[model samples]
Target chain A: QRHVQLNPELRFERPDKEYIPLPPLRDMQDMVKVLFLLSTDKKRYPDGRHRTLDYFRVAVEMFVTEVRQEYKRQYQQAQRNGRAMQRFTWKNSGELAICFACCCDNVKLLYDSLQPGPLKPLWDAFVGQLPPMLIVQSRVPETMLSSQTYHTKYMDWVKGGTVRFPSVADRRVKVETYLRSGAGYKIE
Target chain B: QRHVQLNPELRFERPDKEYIPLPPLRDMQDMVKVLFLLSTDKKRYPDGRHRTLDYFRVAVEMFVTEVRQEYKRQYQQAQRNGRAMQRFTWKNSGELAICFACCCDNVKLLYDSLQPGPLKPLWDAFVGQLPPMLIVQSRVPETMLSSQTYHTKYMDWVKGGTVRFPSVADRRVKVETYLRSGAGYKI
Candidate 1:
């Protein structure tokens, strides 16, 4: 069976130590409510929460811009290393933002607010592909031992080799386990 | 932390032993090519591979219908049992079908084929919500134990209680791990 391997030589080096900025742990429902609030012409929530649409729009734009910069940096490094540029686009970046939001605290709230139609964009974003650098992109390896070795290369690529987002599978397992068990999950 | 608990009495009986049908494993790239083929009017590949848009569409439709039936069966049973209906909708059902396709033998193919425009539907499906019976639908519990208890009740309610989907988190890990590794992955 083919499995991921590492390529130390091909691995790109990082000079700076920084991780992607993520949204603070906040109620996903509140965020969704905010989206709905912005969807309308109104600027304040009945509950007294307030923000202009520009505020949220700018936030999303900043997130997208930062992610795009990350994408560009990776793209340029891959080019310098003479690697094939696996496709990454604005949509994928948007998806990453969504994933980042999904992983923060109050994930259950994020998960629950994902209704169809109004919340379709949020749901669409969760399906965002993780950076191609993070995994083996192909099932068939080219060359001999080398190309396949980079399979394990991505962890080191990140600033500290630790990403802020929780593995989706881990979160789902908790969600499933919590839902399947007739009990209360203490939010910590 | 709130965790799931099992309710023995509320469990619905699964009849016989049959798992949901899944597609035979095929290459993800090939599938994308085939979708592109169908997107056009062409029905046959140069190599004589033959299948029409109608064929693929019908397959997707059938998969959606069967899952809907499963969802409906669960919905009705919950109703008769006087259980508060956990929301399940056509969109979620469609998402399940997409996930099922993603998991079958050729899962890597499905994973890789998920591009934004053409394969948007497939990727969108992976975000499916499992029946909420497993969690707190309401912040406050009613009738003491009963309300908190329903939060963990989905398993037995859906026929055999085993959902066809693996956790989304689990799937994402494999996808990330597989992609990050420069080596080839066996699906």
Candidate 2:
């Protein structure tokens, strides 16, 4: 099997000038509540809870932007090292895929909130952008290697960075669990 | 975490007429060939191979159509049991999510083929349809369960089936491995 790889120089798009900034992790904990609160009657327990498509749109834009920003450093490096990465070992695209899937998994934490609501379609449209947003235009590999994995000197898998963001990422597990639970999850 | 639960009656779209028929298993075995072969050069190794936005579109439409078809029987049963299923055991939507993710993963097997090509945008447009398509209109749960999982008796989960399709599904593993290989994988 061909090993998974990224085009070390692969970059999708430069950060947009006015992209939505994500909520703080503590605030995101409450946004999960906004999803749950909106799922049922919103104004019934209102403390500034709004359930409009536009509100959800911005909320989703934040997560979508975060998914891109989460990988920004690597995307930037891929640019600086385009010519050099052909010689180095790199990641299989499958690994990058796991990262994209997690973005959707996060959205779906709120998805279960509105699955039966009129606004479910909004969440549907928002999550669609997550996967494709992960890929960027890369210079086609100028060189090729046909080791045992490749059939000939053609079709070498383009490889790139396996990225990470520890501070925010580690808590994503915490937040996702908190949202899934009816009882507030504990922290010490 | 809310225990993973399906609505016992949760269903997505019903099987539509004239889904672009999938290439048969052995034929699908070769369709993977069509993707890789078309990726580099097509006319050079011509035994009636094609490379076009439409060809990839259909190949994708076939895969897209198959993802829905793969989950068909469960969706159908969901329709049949809308009334009776309020009390049965069910699945967490997260588990259902893994299944939908696998659908995207399948289209992406060939996605890697089209990724660097002129057709990459087409795959982008195509995969966009996968996640949104997994959901369907479910009834607002009329009843409530405020035990350990639910907060009050009000927001009981509208649950559904934890579905499976054994035959074609089992081979999906077999097929993904076969396609990822540069030196065609074993059966």
Candidate 3:
């Protein structure tokens, strides 16, 4: 059942599925660009700060707007057809590339806007579906800076601006580590 | 200490997180205006075709592209801060509405293309992260066409034109029954 079915049209599956050849998500990118524009205009972080909350908010707003059409289409499809709506998503080769791009922007923003405190609430909201992740500070570094401190546990757990994450067995370790050590403590 | 923390700055978590309003992504209305200038001579569905793979590919390509950006962002965030990455995703609340629009366009293309099988591969690549409950075309009546005379399963299961399923859970049961029996099947 699990076979690598190739799209005869696109025979060559680009190595490094993580490498996105397509242009960035404009709406989301524009959001960042706009915030940058706003910040640069007023020189918010004359020293060139990383991702800020205002900047992230704008970026998420952009991503949300960017996918607007897709969302509407799904809803309409479900309503008219009367079934559990299906969303047209990426698979295999193309998905890898897409994940690469989205994760890149997301990482950049989150690292720059890394907020502090328990990430449980944010994490929970993201479990079932996504869109919450889009708005979660793009990068953890930014999150930390925004929260004030050098807590790098979340960041350390992450990789490639994207997180490989723990498995079922590993998830327990991850959660327990967070609880035993408490929020902000580095996990070893 | 599992608890919900509220932040005001993140636009996604606003008080009205339950439902956020949004407009079309591409501003298709405006794009049409500009596109018209390039081709002054055009007609509605000029070819009078249901749909085409060429059109659906754009939307699928776009979705895959978006998902990639999200992954890359997450990966990079982990590197800079020196931590193993934690998976973060978007919520279905206000943030999901925009996605709904994209879904609409994607489905339209897929349905038009008439390839439902293609959907699984993409789902494998993208939504595979979450892994939802699975059912096949024959398992669900709504997945088929109104006429039982033909088995309408396509290569792409997640196409836009693919039978739109009902939101209600119980309805699916009834649909399954209709499919299993092949009797009293009606839209």
Candidate 4:
């Protein structure tokens, strides 16, 4: 089995000058509320005390974004027939995933907010209970190793970095190395 | 915080097809081979050997599909705001994603085919290592609780489900109980 490795040498287009700076965390939280507040549910709760509604609303928006993108790529693939495809385009893509990490302070804030001694013990209790299941069960495991897992000389030359599967001989060498190295695997 | 209960009664028109069924694992594996074998590479070795190129093509095709959809959505959102955006669309969304996943598999396979054996032993070493650095070094305790430590509740009042968060009057009564029970800090 090959080892998991990053295409350290890979390069891509840098963000354009027009790209806007990302909003702050609090802004995102507030924006999430505002986006949901505009939904039909706001009409029902005139006083604005709804709590869990925001989570569901945010989840829906995220899901919708993901689904819409899925279809958009499929449409594009049919258009490319003759040209040598660009490396990062949808034609060679696979999974798009995100990772979220909470540091000690964020975790403490959550823990403190959900403790029984606090406001609504139920809310605190609920929030406190979810992090573990999420981290342990949902998080992917990536590792680094010091060994000749694959023939680095050949594998490195296959135009690496998150390359797509069913690769040519050179690409295959890297692909097999990656799996063997143990990037994405499930063992029961 | 007000526990907003959800309305369970509301339901959208279920699409005639709810989910795209996943392809069989074996066929998927072979398809992976077909894809990788097709992708282009620079180094050409001697005559028809055991090595072939099918996986690279398939994997690349898959990666592009996923990336493109994200771009399309941004374009559409831009279009809604009257920004200059290119319009685009996909066919066989499920197949495309799977192709992408397997094509991803090809990238993995490439490294493995080239690597030295005992492959299983090599797999265990890298796959097993961990530290999961937070990208910065500081004397910080791990505050994030394990999965067993936290919890979540989705109380939907709009939809009918039990374990409801109290309404105004009901909440008042619960607060009253909190006071009596010495959980007075609860709001």
Alpha-carbon shift of residue A99 in model 2 (angstroms): 40
Candidate with the larger lDDT of 2 and 4: 2
Q: Which ten residues in a row have the lowest lDDT in candidate 3 chain A?
A: A115-124
Q: What is the DockQ (computed on Cα atoms) for candidate 1?
A: 0.02
lDDT for each residue of candidate 3 in A69-160, tens digit (9 for 90 to 100)? 34455557788987765433322222222232333334333332222111111222221112224334233222212221112222322333
lDDT of 2 by residue, A39-79 (tens): 22323422122222222322233333433443454455666
Interface RMSD of 3: 18.9
Candidate 4 on A63-86: residue-level lDDT in tens? 224333543454366456544323
lDDT of 3 by residue, B76-139 (tens): 8877887655443433332222233333343433333322342222422222211110111111
Model 1 in CAPRI terms: which quality? incorrect
The A-chain TM-scores of all the candidates are: 0.26, 0.26, 0.27, 0.23
Q: Is the docking of candidate 3 incorrect, acceptable, medium or high quality?
A: incorrect
iRMS, candidate 1, in Å: value is 14.3
lDDT of 3 at A135: 30
Candidate 4 docking classification = incorrect
